[PDB]
Amino acid sequence: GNPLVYLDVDANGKPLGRVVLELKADVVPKTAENFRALCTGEKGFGYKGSTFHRVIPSFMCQAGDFTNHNGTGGKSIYGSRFPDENFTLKHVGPGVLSMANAGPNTNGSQFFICTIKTDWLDGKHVVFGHVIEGMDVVKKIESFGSKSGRTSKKIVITDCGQLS
Ligand SMILES: O[C@@H]1CO[C@@H]2C[C@H]1Nc1ccc(F)cc12
Ligand SMILES: O[C@@H]1CO[C@@H]2C[C@H]1Nc1ccc(F)cc12
């Protein structure tokens, strides 16, 4: 079946809790595999020790830039970027896990967790999972955001991996 992955998040060195995500490998296997391996760190690089660098209240919480920590970086397990697998899953509401990008077919490692229905991103961003547990943690992350995306606290993924 589909993998379950986790992100243990800190805000200025104090733990906020765990966000558990279901990766829709059934619909987007390439995109789900990329995220899964980046959580376990089995390819020699991944999300552990990196940040939520772009957090916007009433929109989303963006992370995944483990190379530059500023929105210009991160990489996939396949290479520096990979194609948009498909646009089958929609940005239906809060809790949606989707890929961050810089235009068509520029998927790396950067991703976001929606805090609202982001329907205008359908056909532009690849949806590949959703929050199973820890939406209270996502809401804590959100509260440390601003309109610019700048965080008021340093939000770090201290640990991440695969549950099943
Ligand atoms: O072709 C340009 C240059 O490279 C990629 C795709 C596209 N826009 C962009 C923006 C930010 C970034 F960090 C990386 C990129
Ligand atoms: O190679 C691609 C395109 O450029 C960088 C690295 C990688 N993924 C990504 C995603 C969002 C973004 F804003 C910037 C990037």
Q: Does residue 110's CB lie within 6 angstroms of at least one atom of ligand 2?
A: yes
Run of H or E including 111: strand 111-114
Candidate from 78, 81, 99 with most ligand 2 atoms within 8 A of CB, to mutate: 81
Query: Which positions ≥6 away from 93 have C-beta within 8 Å?
Result: 114, 116, 117
Q: Does residue 108's CB lie within 6 angstroms of at least one atom of ligand 2?
A: yes
Euclidean distance between CA atoms 36 and 98, whole angstroms: 13
List the structure tokens of 153. 């606290």
The coordinates were experimentally obtained by X-ray
Euclidean distance between CA atoms 109 and 153, whole angstroms: 22
Which fold is adopted by the domain 1-164? Cyclophilin (2.40.100)
List the structure tokens of 58. 């009433």
List the structure tokens of 95. 């809790």
What resolution in angstroms, rounded to 1 decimal? Answer: 2.0
> What is the 152 CA–ligand 1 centroid distance (Å)?
26
Catalytic residue among 7, 34, 101, 107: 101
